[PDB]
Write an enzyme that holds these catalytic residues in place. Structure first.
Site, PDB file in Angstrom:
ATOM      1  N   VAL A  21      17.064  36.741  32.436  1.00  0.00           N
ATOM      2  CA  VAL A  21      17.933  35.661  32.025  1.00  0.00           C
ATOM      3  C   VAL A  21      17.155  34.784  31.044  1.00  0.00           C
ATOM      4  O   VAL A  21      16.095  34.214  31.376  1.00  0.00           O
ATOM      5  CB  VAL A  21      18.479  34.871  33.228  1.00  0.00           C
ATOM      6  CG1 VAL A  21      19.156  33.606  32.768  1.00  0.00           C
ATOM      7  CG2 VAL A  21      19.455  35.732  34.014  1.00  0.00           C
ATOM      8  N   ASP A  22      17.684  34.690  29.829  1.00  0.00           N
ATOM      9  CA  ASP A  22      16.912  34.144  28.720  1.00  0.00           C
ATOM     10  C   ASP A  22      17.684  33.071  27.989  1.00  0.00           C
ATOM     11  O   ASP A  22      18.434  33.381  27.070  1.00  0.00           O
ATOM     12  CB  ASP A  22      16.559  35.270  27.743  1.00  0.00           C
ATOM     13  CG  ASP A  22      15.537  34.843  26.699  1.00  0.00           C
ATOM     14  OD1 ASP A  22      15.133  33.658  26.687  1.00  0.00           O
ATOM     15  OD2 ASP A  22      15.124  35.705  25.888  1.00  0.00           O
ATOM     16  N   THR A  23      17.473  31.811  28.373  1.00  0.00           N
ATOM     17  CA  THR A  23      18.171  30.689  27.746  1.00  0.00           C
ATOM     18  C   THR A  23      17.720  30.478  26.304  1.00  0.00           C
ATOM     19  O   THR A  23      18.395  29.797  25.524  1.00  0.00           O
ATOM     20  CB  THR A  23      18.011  29.395  28.549  1.00  0.00           C
ATOM     21  OG1 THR A  23      16.618  29.064  28.642  1.00  0.00           O
ATOM     22  CG2 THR A  23      18.633  29.563  29.953  1.00  0.00           C
TER      23      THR A  23
END
Lengths: 114, 112
Positions: A21-23
C-alpha cells in the site's frame, strides 16, 4: 517474499495480487504477470529516475467497497506491486501505524489483509 | 506548489519541511540543501531503478509528542521530501482517504 506492511491482497482479473500500500504512488502498478498490455504508455517518475512504461488493458478489481474496472502501469523494474492513491481513494482506506506494524482498514472499520 | 495529499509539515533541524506522506517509502527522504551529510550511503531501489544516496547526519525532528533525532536519505532525484514508514511508526500515524482528499492524523485522531 511478500511486500512489507501495510499490504493488501486483492483479486485483480481473477488472480490474487499482494500489493504494498503506497500513498506515495499516483497510480497503481503490477510488476510481473500483468496479462494483456495496451499499446498506450506513460512517463513514470520514480525516486531515483524516470522511464516510459505501458498500461495494462482493463482489469476487474475486487475492492471491499465493491468491484471496479482499473488499468495498471506495468513496471517490471519495480520491486513490489503498488496500490496507489488512485485505488486508495476508491477504497476510502484507513492505514494505521499504531500497534506493531501497520494495518489497512476499510471505511466500515473492518481490517483488510494480505 | 506543495506535494500532493497526504502531506504533513514537520520541523527538521529547526525549520518546517512539507513531506509527501509515503507508506511505500522504507525510510524518509530529503531532496534539497539537506545540511551535513554522513560519510555513509544507502542503495535506494525506486520504481524505475536504483543507485546510492548519502545519509544525512542526525537531525532534531519535532513530532506530535516529543523531539526525536533521525537521519534522512538525501535523494535529489526525488521530486518531494517523503515521510516514510520509519517516522510513520514513530508518529503512530493514521492516514485516512476521504472524498478525493487524504488526511494524516495521530494515534487517536489528532490532526497533523
Amino acid at each position: 517474499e511478500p511486500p512489507p506492511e501495510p499490504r493488501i491482497t486483492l483479486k485483480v482479473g481473477g488472480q490474487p495480487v499482494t500489493f504494498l500500500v503506497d500513498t506515495g504512488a499516483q497510480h497503481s502498478v503490477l510488476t510481473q504477470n500483468p496479462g494483456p498490455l495496451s499499446d498506450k504508455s506513460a512517463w513514470v517518475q520514480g525516486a531515483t529516475g524516470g522511464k516510459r512504461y505501458r498500461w495494462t488493458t482493463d482489469r476487474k478489481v475486487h475492492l471491499a467497497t465493491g468491484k471496479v474496472t482499473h488499468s495498471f502501469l506495468h513496471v517490471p523494474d519495480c520491486p513490489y506491486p503498488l496500490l496507489g492513491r488512485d485505488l486508495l481513494t476508491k477504497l476510502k482506506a484507513q492505514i494505521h501505524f499504531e500497534g506493531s506494524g501497520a494495518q489497512v482498514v476499510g471505511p466500515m472499520g473492518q481490517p483488510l489483509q494480505v
